[PDB]
């Protein structure tokens, strides 16, 4: 899920704080490439 | 031989199985190779019934394994809300902990199940116990990202 990936640990500072992935980048599942875009009459459509 | 014909009966849920098995004096407490009890595969698989006739049949509902986990945290860890009402109201630690610190607790807030986490904490669930590496069960909220859990625990 993307809820364990933004608990990832990337380091832990000096004052004990833990700094998580979600803290330095947005978790979100989206598509491998955003290049293809297919519509079916105008509406929003995939295809094969 | 009569323990383990229990156990099989307790794990694939035959409710009929373990009442005929009872009558013939099985052993309630027979534990397998790893320590589980037939009740710690009731509340592991999610059989309210079967958890039901074992406690009847004066099963110890503080059992641990080889490991020092006891029913109460496999049915907090796995979502079975019926079972840990069950359970609690035979008499069961709600502090218990196993060979990491890790109480009943702890296992219901990493897995989201704000029902059980009401449940335990009403019948004297310590909010401020720790496991191995000094972790709360708020500590875990935080971590995970439940904001619902952490607004219960303070």
């Known amino acids: 899920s993307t809820e364990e990936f933004g608990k990832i640990l990337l380091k832990v500072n000096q004052d004990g704080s833990r700094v998580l ?28 | 031989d009569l323990g383990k014909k229990l156990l099989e009966a307790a ?51 503080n059992a641990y394994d080889t490991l020092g986990s006891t029913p109460l945290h496999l049915a907090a860890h796995f979502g079975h809300l019926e079972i840990v009402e069950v359970l609690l109201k035979n008499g069961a630690d709600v502090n218990a902990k196993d060979d990491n610190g890790i109480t009943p607790l702890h296992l219901a807030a990493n897995r989201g199940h704000l029902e059980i986490v009401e449940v335990l904490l009403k019948y004297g669930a310590d909010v401020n116990a720790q496991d191995k590496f000094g972790k709360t069960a708020f500590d875990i909220s935080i971590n995970n990202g439940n904001e619902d859990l952490a607004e219960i625990l303070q």
Do not use: C
């Open chain 1, 21 to 48: 992935l979600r803290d330095v980048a947005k978790i979100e599942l989206g598509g491998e490439n955003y290049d293809i875009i297919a519509e079916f009459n105008g509406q929003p459509a995939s295809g094969l």
């Open chain 2, 11 to 61: 794990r694939a849920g035959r409710d009929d199985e373990v009442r005929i098995l009872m009558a013939n004096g099985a052993d309630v407490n027979a534990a397998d190779v790893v320590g589980w009890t037939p009740l710690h595969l009731a509340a592991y698989w999610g059989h309210l019934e079967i958890v039901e006739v074992l406690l009847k049949n004066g099963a110890d509902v």
